Design a protein around this ligand. Structure first.
Ligand SMILES: CC(C)C[C@H](NC(=O)[C@@H](NC(=O)[C@H](CCONC(=N)N)NC(=O)OCc1ccccc1)C(C)C)[C@@H](O)CC(=O)NCCc1ccccc1
Length: 395
């Protein structure tokens, strides 16, 4: 019975490698496309002075054309929020995990968020103008980035806290529901009607106050626990991470099983049979649920589910059929099912593994953990929810 405001998301894993939405900024409104990013806190984009940025769907935001825009000046005053002051403006800067360094200056202006059912919420936000962009940002259709994390006590008020402060008719919950193509952002709750069958939401406490981290205790495949370490892994729930990132030790164990499932020479029956026998020797023992492993192999072989490899040895199958579920054990020791229609993504006519080794010791639950689920950010109760869903698609 909760009031829900719904926003269209566009995007995919293979071609965009993010999901984005449109927002209005300034007076009169300027439509701007933003990467939906629960892994950062800012709202930012190029602005018209920019001489070192990338080309995007929209022209850089034009400050002179917004009657309500206001650049944040300093060095005749102090920069609030402990920001740097360079050449008289409060400096915007962000280092991202992928390696991008984005810098510029801060300004505030009116933000208008409008649902596709014409429900409008409007407020001023302190936003960053990109004056320098880098690397992946130079090859990106989306114009800017919309961080969805929470405000710190003496920090910049973020989009999400502002949205709810100016929309008291909504409960402080946002849900991301991504498909292979586009998806949906919901403010005010989740939609039970999208839920598969009717399946129940699996809840976890967030492990840090202003960021979306949860603990993962185990990661099973064919009945084998691949996590070697005792402390649960603290993983960022990040819609701005194309893939799910895991430790090397963990990745290599999973990848060993995925390598065997990846048969690149089905035309070669002799070599296939050799793989089968090699697999029976190696894994027909109590360390593995061998039944399921052979079940998976036979399915893959019977349906001629050919595999090919792409960059860094990532495996791509013709079909989802035959691939096993992975099982994620969360904090309260719930064993959650991670299906191939999530951890594999569509690339051309194949389904490719959306799991990588981590960089900088940062484990991340990325879009391949969001896909075909409702991921529910219950800000009020400090928890994140997961449930299998038929998410909307765009286009
Ligand atoms: C939009 C993006 C820059 C947001 C950022 N995500 C990331 O940095 C991740 N980036 C990715 O997954 C990127 C995002 C998409 O491309 N990036 C872009 N256009 N700018 N994907 C990506 O590299 O996949 C490669 C690719 C590129 C093109 C086509 C197909 C595949 C890293 C982890 C691999 C954010 O979610 C995490 C972050 O760095 N936040 C900064 C604050 C912080 C710092 C440390 C920990 C937690 C938070």
């Amino acid at each position: 019975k909760d009031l829900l405001y719904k926003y269209k998301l566009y995007g995919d894993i293979d071609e965009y490698a993010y999901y984005f939405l449109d927002i209005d900024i300034g007076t009169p409104e300027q439509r701007i496309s933003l990467i939906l990013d629960t892994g950062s806190s800012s709202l930012s984009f190029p602005c018209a002075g920019c001489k070192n940025c990338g080309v995007h769907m929209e022209n850089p935001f034009n400050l002179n054309n917004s009657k309500t825009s206001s650049i944040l000046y300093c060095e005749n005053e102090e920069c609030p929020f402990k920001l740097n002051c360079v050449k008289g403006k409060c400096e915007y800067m962000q280092s991202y995990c992928e390696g991008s360094q984005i810098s510029g200056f801060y300004f505030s202006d009116v933000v208008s968020v409008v649902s596709y059912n014409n429900e409008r919420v409007t407020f001023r936000k302190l936003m960053g103008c990109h004056m320098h962009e880098e690397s992946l940002f130079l090859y990106q259709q989306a114009t800017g980035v919309l961080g969805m994390s929470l405000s710190k006590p003496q920090g910049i008020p973020t989009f999400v806290n502002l949205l709810f402060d100016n929309a008291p008719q909504l409960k402080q919950v946002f849900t991301i529901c991504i498909s292979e193509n586009g998806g949906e952002l919901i403010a005010g709750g989740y939609d039970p009607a999208y839920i598969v069958r009717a399946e129940k939401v699996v809840w976890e406490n967030v492990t840090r106050k202003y960021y979306y981290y949860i603990k993962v205790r185990g990661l099973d495949m064919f009945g084998t626990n691949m996590m070697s370490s005792s402390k649960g892994l603290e993983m960022l729930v990040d819609s701005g991470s194309t893939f799910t990132h895991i430790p090397e030790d963990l990745y290599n164990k999973l990848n060993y099983f995925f390598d065997i499932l990846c048969i690149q020479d089905m035309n070669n029956a002799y070599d296939v049979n050799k793989r089968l026998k090699m697999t029976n020797e190696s894994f027909n023992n109590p360390l593995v649920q061998f039944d399921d492993f052979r079940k998976s192999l036979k399915s893959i072989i019977a349906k001629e589910n050919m595999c090919v490899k792409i960059v860094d040895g990532v495996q791509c199958w013709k079909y989802l059929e035959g691939l096993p579920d992975l099982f994620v054990t969360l904090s309260n020791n719930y064993k959650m099912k991670w299906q191939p229609h999530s951890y594999l993504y569509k690339k051309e006519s194949f389904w490719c593994k959306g799991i990588e080794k981590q960089v900088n010791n940062k484990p991340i639950l990325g879009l391949t953990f969001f896909k075909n689920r409702q991921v529910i950010f219950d800000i009020q109760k400090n928890r994140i929810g997961f449930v299998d869903a038929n998410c909307p698609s765009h286009p």
